[PDB]
Design a protein around this ligand. Structure first.
Ligand SMILES: Nc1ncnc2c1ncn2[C@@H]1O[C@H](COP(=O)(O)OP(=O)(O)OP(=O)(O)O)[C@@H](O)[C@H]1O
Ligand SMILES: *[C@@H]1O[C@H](CO)[C@@H](O[C@@H]2O[C@H](CO)[C@@H](O)[C@H](O)[C@H]2NC(C)=O)[C@H](O)[C@H]1NC(C)=O
Ligand SMILES: [Ca+2]
Ligand SMILES: [Ca+2]
Ligand SMILES: [Mg+2]
Lengths: 260, 17, 361
């Protein structure tokens, strides 16, 4: 079971209408049984429908989806999109984080995490949840810290300890400095294993930053992780691209991990 | 028929929705 | 024992309660079924969306328009739309409400019977009625003789009505309406140098049409005025913030109604069809039609349209004919309003077809 989180810069109609860019985005996505896509900027779901048309052109059920409404603090809005191979996992339940009122999610998160419970017979973990977050860069420490409270909310709701939390957390460089890690409960609590290290470069740009991360809780889920499998996927190196073509795809690499 | 057209011509007061 | 009024059009459903002055619900006459398998966060799998939600999620759906040029052509989809109307939009139990439905001029009798069959067998209404759209628009204006011009999203008709009797032999149908006008506005703005590529961008054009377009009283003169000065330019601010300015497209767009050749059609324009419709009628009633030309439907909302119609009909009619165009401020909802009125009159109440009656037919 190969899982990833991929921030695709301003994923939308224009990007998906570009046959070359679509082609590379499809190749990336097909590596994975579950992939989370962030920065979806698709007012009428046309780009998402287009990606699914490519993915499902030979078998209508190659991939199934979970997608949010447009989210954001202000008028700039983005969706979370999960694409999963239904012969690998089934979606049992989903919800968007609330904090107990209609618009309370926005009290702690610009883009309220989408939370998906999967059933997975091919791994040692049988049910687990994934929490998606694309944090606001200027609020990274607080939002990653609040993911602790999301994990608690998942626990109370679904009586589940096995939870993977992933996405572009903006977790490095000017947005989370070394001294600040101690204030982030998701990091200081020994309930959590951080699979992408602070040393990792997850940007397709010339910055060296571990923005994108994959965190796991739950003893069964932790036991399912294949050692050495969590890493960024450098598609510029993989596909022998120029840096310019690479940046046309996204300014982030996917982060990936394998479960068994 | 005649009675109906009579009422139509005279109008009805419709309420705010 | 409060009746429902449902006015189903090619583009919009207008639905509401008899006795009210406006529909409670207006939404796109569209049904979309997901092209792929999956869910919106926190929701279950949906087999279909109707109305506004279908439009806004269209990229993952296959859309169908079950009303074409005013006529219902897809019954499974139409059932979905009526289901959505009762339960989601109006939030009623249809078995509790007499229901008035509208139909297009020249609707086949087999089509009216299928409507009736669904309302009784599928929705269990206690009672219902089907009225002709144009006749209701005329009623709405407090009259029983006149000729209606009804122009919506998909179709334009002229309907002469003599003491409440729509004259089917004189009805004219023109397959050019609001949708064609939006598409043509997009084309000519594109020719100017603007660009409508994304769904969000293309969606804006319909709003530019409805906010800035108008009918010139003298088209050729208005063209020279537009070329002569910037006096007819108007600006439209895009959702983002960019302001754009348009001149002659403002009146070229609806001029298509009077000159269908602008979109490549060889047909008579709406002033010609109004005249020809009146000319199919007994000479003895023409004076009453000319003096009571009622405009109804969204596509009659352009500023200037009544004055230009008064002018073109005057040029075609006998020189002594008194000519009057009636264009009420509410005319985008006139059919619905006439339905609201009719269903509330005491003389109408014997006219409902009851469940009992349908069973004994
Ligand atoms: N202010 C306006 N100016 C110009 N056009 C308008 C305006 N308001 C609405 N319209 C147009 O009216 C059309 C919808 O009107 P209406 O509800 O009467 O049609 P409908 O009943 O769906 O269609 P039809 O009568 O063709 O079956 C749309 O094309 C809309 O763009
Ligand atoms: C698809 O995207 C690529 C990458 O951005 C576009 O190619 C670039 O765009 C212009 C072409 O006029 C030039 O700057 C470069 O030749 C291209 N850059 C790279 C990295 O190759 C391409 O044009 C897009 N296709 C379309 C039809 O828009
Ligand atoms: Ca980098
Ligand atoms: Ca209509
Ligand atoms: Mg680092």
């Amino acid at each position: 079971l190969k899982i990833a989180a991929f921030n695709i810069r301003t994923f939308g109609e224009t990007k998906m209408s570009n046959a070359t860019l679509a082609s590379y985005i499809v190749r990336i996505v097909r590596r994975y049984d579950i992939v989370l896509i962030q920065e979806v900027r698709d007012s009428h779901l046309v780009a998402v429908g287009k990606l699914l048309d490519y993915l499902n052109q030979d078998d209508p059920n190659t991939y199934h989806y979970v997608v949010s409404e447009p989210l954001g603090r202000n008028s700039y809005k983005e969706r979370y999109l999960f694409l999963f191979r239904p012969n690998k996992v089934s979606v049992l339940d989903t919800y968007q984080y609330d904090d107990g009122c209609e618009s309370c999610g926005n009290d702690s998160f610009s883009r309220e995490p989408a939370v998906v419970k999967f059933s997975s017979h091919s791994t040692k973990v049988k049910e687990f949840a994934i929490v998606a977050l694309h944090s606001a860069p200027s609020d990274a420490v607080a939002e990653i810290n609040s993911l602790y409270d999301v994990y608690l909310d998942v626990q109370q709701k679904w009586h589940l300890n096995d939870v993977m939390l992933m996405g572009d957390f903006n977790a490095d460089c000017s947005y989370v400095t070394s001294s600040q890690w101690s204030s982030i409960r998701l990091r200081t609590s020994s309930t959590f294993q951080w699979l992408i290290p602070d040393s990792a470069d997850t940007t397709a740009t010339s910055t060296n930053c571990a923005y994108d991360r994959i965190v796991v809780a739950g003893s069964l889920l932790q036991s399912s992780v294949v050692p050495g499998s969590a890493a960024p996927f450098d598609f510029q190196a993989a596909y022998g691209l120029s840096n310019e073509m690479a940046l046309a795809i996204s300014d982030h690499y996917p982060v990936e991990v394998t479960l068994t | 028929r005649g009675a109906l057209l009579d009422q139509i011509r005279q109008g009805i007061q419709l309420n705010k929705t | 024992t409060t009746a429902l009024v449902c006015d189903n059009g090619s583009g919009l459903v207008k639905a509401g309660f008899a006795g009210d002055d406006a529909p409670r619900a207006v939404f796109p006459s569209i049904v979309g079924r997901p092209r792929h398998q999956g869910v919106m966060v926190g929701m279950g799998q949906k087999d279909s969306y109707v109305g506004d939600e279908a439009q806004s999620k269209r990229g993952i759906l296959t859309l169908k328009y079950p009303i074409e040029h005013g006529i219902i052509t897809n019954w499974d989809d139409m059932e979905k739309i009526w289901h959505h109307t009762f339960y989601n939009e109006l939030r009623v139990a249809p078995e509790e409400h007499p229901t008035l439905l509208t139909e297009a001029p020249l609707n086949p009798k087999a089509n009216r019977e299928k409507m009736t069959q669904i309302m009784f067998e599928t929705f269990n209404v206690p009672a219902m009625y089907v009225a002709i759209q144009a006749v209701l628009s005329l009623y709405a204006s407090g009259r029983t003789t006149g000729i209606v011009l009804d122009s919506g999203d998909g179709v334009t008709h002229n309907v002469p009505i003599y003491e409440g009797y729509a004259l089917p032999h004189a009805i004219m149908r023109l397959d050019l309406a609001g949708r064609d006008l939006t598409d043509y506005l997009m084309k000519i703005l594109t020719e100017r140098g603007y660009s409508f590529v994304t769904t969000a961008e293309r969606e804006i054009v319909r709003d530019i049409k409805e906010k800035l377009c108008y009918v010139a009283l003298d088209f050729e003169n208005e063209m020279a005025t537009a070329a002569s000065s910037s006096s007819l330019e108007k600006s439209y601010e895009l959702p983002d913030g960019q302001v754009i300015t348009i001149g002659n497209e403002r009146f070229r767009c609806p001029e298509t109604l009077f000159q269908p050749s602008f979109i490549g059609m060889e047909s008579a324009g709406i002033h010609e069809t109004t005249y020809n419709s009146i000319m199919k009628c007994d000479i003895d009633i023409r004076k009453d039609l000319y003096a009571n030309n009622v405009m109804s439907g969204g596509t009659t909302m352009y500023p200037g349209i009544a004055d230009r119609m008064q002018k073109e009909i005057t040029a075609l009619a006998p020189s002594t004919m008194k000519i009057k165009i009636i264009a009420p401020p509410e005319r985008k909802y006139s059919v619905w309003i006439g339905g609201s009125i009719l269903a509330s009159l005491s003389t109408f109440q014997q006219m409902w077809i009851t469940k009992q009656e349908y069973d004994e037919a």
